[PDB]
Design a protein around this ligand. Structure first.
Ligand SMILES: O=c1ccn([C@@H]2O[C@H](COP(=O)(O)OP(=O)(O)O)[C@@H](O)[C@H]2O)c(=O)[nH]1
Ligand SMILES: [Mn+2]
Length: 276
């Protein structure tokens, strides 16, 4: 059950003035594409706080990648879901190298030791029961990243993918999908909506487990068939999101590399970015 929103004073949405005219803000299957200017964060924060939403964030930090954790967590504290309950799940081969990062109230961190792309398996079968019990949504990201601006409840939905920053302007034939019919991740040149980046996807616990289960199974089939998809987990993610349309798509504001790609006019904010 969802209670009434309180009285709120904000600018009237205007039907005969689009928010953004420069970009596609809804997919052909009617999923919002999330850009700055498309959402009133006060309205969304109210909706999700009234549901006492808890967001789990998974991150893998194996071998040398433990070095990225301090900046990743410190900036997540500044920018990720502030005001909401957050549970970070850090998967690592070096529990003692996880930095002591100070967390705001309502936020917690769990270190999960793993053996010394396997992310799909670890998210899916091993952590299944726990996630269902502890969080409402799961967000799965790369660790070699930092938050630079707001990343909030505007992203939450049963299933989301993020536009890869190198391909958002590209034709589908240019997308680096797996192109060999022998792979489970195969997508032909006349198919594809977008090229989604493996570094930022998520949704409800149920939908994320479905996705990671499906991708883990497809990867296993490929392995048994002696084939490895061109872009590994990302290739399989793209195949999944082709056949199971996401209910929101995040713009490249949500996964950017300023060193590689600069700061184009179309991006009003750079929210979550590669660390060189
Ligand atoms: O030795 C490694 C390699 C990869 N990773 C994890 O898996 C992601 C692997 O992708 P990587 O960032 O190296 O390449 P990219 O996705 O940027 O092309 C990293 O963010 C880490 O979270 C890791 O922890 N240790
Ligand atoms: Mn990365």
């Amino acid at each position: 059950f969802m209670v009434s929103l309180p009285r709120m004073v904000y600018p009237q949405p205007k039907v005969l003035t689009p928010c953004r005219k420069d970009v596609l803000v809804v997919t052909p299957w009617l999923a919002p594409i999330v850009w700055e200017g498309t959402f009133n964060i006060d309205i969304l924060n109210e909706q999700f706080r009234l549901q006492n939403t808890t967001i789990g964030l998974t991150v893998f930090a194996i071998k040398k990648y433990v070095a990225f954790l301090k900046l990743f967590l410190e900036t997540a504290e500044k920018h990720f879901m502030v005001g909401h309950r957050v549970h970070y799940y850090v998967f690592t081969d070096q529990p003692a190298a996880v930095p002591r990062v100070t967390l705001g109230t309502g936020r917690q961190l769990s270190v999960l030791e793993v053996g010394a792309m396997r992310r799909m398996e670890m998210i899916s079968d091993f952590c299944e029961r726990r996630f269902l019990s502890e969080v409402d949504y799961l967000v799965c990201v790369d660790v070699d990243m930092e938050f630079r601006d707001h990343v909030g409840v505007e992203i939450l939905t049963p299933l989301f993918g993020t536009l890869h920053p190198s391909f958002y302007g590209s034709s589908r034939e240019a997308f680096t999908y797996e192109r060999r019919p022998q792979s489970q991740a195969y997508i032909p040149k006349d198919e594809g909506d977008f090229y989604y980046m493996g570094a930022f996807f998520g949704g409800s616990v149920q939908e994320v487990q479905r996705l990671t289960r499906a991708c883990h199974q497809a990867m296993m089939v490929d392995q048994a068939n002696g084939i490895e998809a061109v872009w590994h987990d990302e290739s399989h993610l793209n195949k999944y999101l082709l056949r199971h349309k996401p209910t929101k798509v995040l713009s490249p504001e949500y996964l950017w590399d300023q060193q590689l790609l600069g700061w184009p006019a179309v991006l009003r904010k750079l929210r979550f970015t590669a660390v060189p």
